[PDB]
């Protein structure tokens, strides 16, 4: 799933916070 221009958007999704790094967007296990 995850590249880095998408966990900088996931990361962004990262204030999608459930997770402060739990995990959002280098939190990411993903791809």
């Given at each position: 799933?995850?590249?880095e221009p998408t966990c900088r958007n996931r990361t962004r999704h990262l204030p999608l916070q459930f997770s402060?790094?739990?995990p959002l967007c280098p939190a990411c296990?993903?791809?």
């Open positions: 799933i995850c590249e402060r790094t739990g296990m993903k791809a």
